[PDB]
């Protein structure tokens, strides 16, 4: 080595911070690092500009390289003002933390080089650009510059609801203040969702996030293979949200829902519920309007670890959510939904992938009253447990003789096999992802496939078998439903695609099946 210049106190530490072993040949990395262990440090001596540049005498005859490290130190310059122009929403506060020299401190260009870049990960700048006090040679600034509502239309097709539309306007900057306002609208066989939504991501300067949701879920049952009941429901929820980890979050809020239960196909499973609340209309005729207004408190949690957003095969994803009313509304209940996700890659080459998503739920009515039936859990279908028709798993209802009708001589509980759902849900599925063959091996690493063994068990936690002999006890703890098969998912300029074929191997009588299902657009 050699030192030629004023280091202000690193003159001897060259062989300790910037050392190599003699005999090592001319390197552009392990000799430049000798330059670059004192090129960044010197902003810890208040020195603003640490300059290290070393130009050896490249000697070839008997091959020694005599390094000559001209290090001249900077000087002690300070942090007066941080100035952003053109942007009416970005703050001088968060755009200080995402840089690494606070206001009122010894300042340097080279040790603010740890700050300028991360400011762009806000997701709203196109560029993130980067002063001695104007005409005064001691105090100094750090400055930046920034360069800164699109419709969207969705049309899909499918098996669970066939046709499917989306259309809504998003504008993630309300007049220059960072509020995220977004609208959405979806229509298909059973529900039509037309929602407005707002958010302020920084309620507190430190991260608290407040969203107020105005939704409307004009739903319908018969087209969705269930039994008969119609729902036009409107409600509004508001939730807080505060970051805690960047691997976590948390939320809490107050949620008011209002439902119009009507047009019910008389049947025991819901007619237990009507009594306990206090409504007993005619037991075989369908002109009845049960109205609920539920206020309900809600909360959640989250976790993210995946490395790649698109076609992810790493990390671990989690979710929790619960809910409970105050005991001062119409129906009183609570609800607990847990979610999981895990993409385990076994080696760096990343062709073997392991995935399995566990989900749990449970609900109950508190003071002896019952969970509303439209809030139950449904299992079986394409998106959760492939092979069995959508919703088809869940202890079936029992139609009354209504107008099972008295024209044919119906005078009892006509046993039915129609899916209704349930209140305790548990779905596991272990999936074992494998390479993509049969296409050119140049690009045979894209179109994903997997073999899967999906289970699903919803039951009525309060269903009776004292009173129903000829029927089984529909609360069996191990009435599992496994299935297997295949399916191919990928990207193409016509949206998200997948095609499937899954054989239902295990099931019980009364459990329908659906071997084949597809997805284009959205499901």
């Amino acid at each position: 080595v050699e030192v030629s210049g004023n280091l202000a106190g690193h003159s001897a530490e060259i062989e300790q911070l910037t050392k190599i072993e003699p005999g090592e040949l001319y390197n552009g990395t392990k000799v430049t690092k000798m330059e670059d262990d004192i090129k960044k440090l010197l902003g810890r001596y208040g020195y603003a500009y640490p300059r290290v540049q070393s130009m050896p005498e490249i000697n070839d005859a008997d091959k020694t390289v005599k390094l000559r490290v001209n290090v001249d130190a900077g000087n002690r310059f300070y942090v007066r003002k941080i100035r952003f122009e053109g942007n009416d929403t970005s703050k001088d506060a968060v755009l200080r933390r995402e840089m690494r020299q606070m206001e009122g401190a010894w300042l340097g260009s080279d040790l603010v080089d740890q700050g300028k870049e991360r400011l762009n990960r806000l997701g709203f700048f196109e560029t993130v650009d980067t002063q001695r006090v104007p005409g005064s040679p001691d105090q100094v600034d750090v400055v930046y510059k920034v360069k800164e509502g699109s419709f969207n239309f969705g049309i899909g097709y499918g098996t669970e609801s066939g046709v499917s539309f989306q259309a809504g306007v998003q504008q993630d900057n309300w007049l220059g203040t960072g509020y995220a306002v977004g609208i959405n609208g979806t229509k298909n066989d059973y529900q039509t969702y037309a929602e407005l939504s707002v958010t302020n991501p920084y309620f507190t300067v430190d991260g608290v996030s407040l969203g107020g949701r105005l939704f409307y879920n004009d739903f319908q049952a018969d087209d969705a293979d269930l039994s008969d009941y119609t729902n036009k429901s409107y409600g509004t929820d508001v939730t807080l949200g505060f970051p805690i980890n960047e691997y976590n979050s948390l939320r809490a809020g107050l949620g008011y829902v209002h439902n119009s239960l009507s047009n019910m196909q008389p049947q025991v499973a819901m007619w237990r519920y009507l009594y306990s609340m206090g409504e007993h209309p005619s037991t075989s005729d369908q002109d009845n309007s049960f109205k609920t207004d539920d206020f309900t408190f809600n909360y959640g949690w989250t976790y993210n670890k995946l490395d790649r957003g698109y076609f992810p095969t790493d990390g671990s994803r989690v979710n929790l959510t619960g809910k409970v009313t105050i005991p001062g509304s119409d129906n009183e209940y609570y609800k607990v939904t847990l979610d999981t996700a895990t993409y385990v890659p076994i080696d760096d080459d990343h062709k073997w992938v392991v995935l399995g998503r566990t989900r749990w739920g449970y609900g109950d009515g508190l003071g002896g009253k019952e969970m509303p039936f439209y809030e139950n859990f449904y299992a079986g279908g394409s998106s959760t447990v492939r092979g069995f028709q959508s919703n088809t798993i869940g202890p079936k209802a029992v139609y009354f003789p209504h107008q099972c009708a008295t024209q044919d001589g119906a005078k009892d509980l006509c046993k039915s096999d129609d899916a209704v759902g349930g209140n305790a849900m548990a779905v596991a599925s272990l999936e074992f992802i494998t390479p993509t063959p049969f296409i050119s091996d140049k690009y045979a690493n894209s179109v994903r496939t997997s073999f899967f063994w999906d289970m699903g068990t919803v039951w009525d936690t309060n269903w009776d078998s004292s009173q129903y002999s000829g029927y089984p006890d529909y609360s069996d703890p191990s009435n599992i439903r496994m299935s297997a098969g295949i399916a191919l998912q990928w990207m193409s300029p016509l949206g998200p695609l997948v095609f499937s074929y899954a054989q239902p191997f295990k099931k019980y009588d009364g459990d329908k099946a659906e071997q084949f299902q597809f997805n284009i657009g959205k499901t």
């Binding site: 608290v208 005991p327 001062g328």
Partner: protein, 138 residues
């Protein structure tokens, strides 16, 4: 219960063990007592911990609508008390020490109170690192 129990001259964290730290000497002037704050300003946890406990306490009084009002007044009162007691349980007794290094200077450093009772005029050693300094006696 934020753990600011590492801010004494008699406790070290895990991250600064088995590492080389310089030694500088000095004498001491002007010890005086001072309190130390440690934690956050939002106190996002004490608020919830006081809020649920003050909220469930509402469900004990009244009935009908009179209950559903007390179960919110109690909730915000518990919310206030949660921060009012969490951030008053992070106070710690401590000291503020002027020292004159033998190198010729004077510096100030502040520490949590421990067992030893310093004096104005004594020899104390500065186990120095990259901008963390602990003042042990002798």
């Amino acid at each position: 219960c934020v753990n600011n129990d590492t801010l004494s001259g008699d406790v070290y964290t895990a991250s600064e063990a088995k590492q080389v730290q310089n030694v500088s000497y000095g004498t001491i002037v002007n010890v005086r007592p001072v309190q130390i704050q440690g934690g956050d300003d939002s106190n996002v946890i004490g608020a919830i911990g006081g809020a649920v406990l003050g909220g469930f306490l509402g469900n004990t009084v009244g009935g009908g609508t009179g209950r559903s009002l007390a179960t919110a007044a109690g909730a915000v009162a518990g919310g206030v008390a949660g921060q009012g007691v969490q951030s008053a349980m992070n106070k710690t007794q401590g000291v503020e020490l002027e020292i004159r290094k033998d190198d010729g200077n004077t510096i100030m450093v502040v520490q949590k109170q421990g067992n030893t009772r310093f004096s104005p005029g004594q020899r104390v050693v500065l186990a120095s690192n990259g901008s963390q300094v602990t003042v042990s006696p002798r």
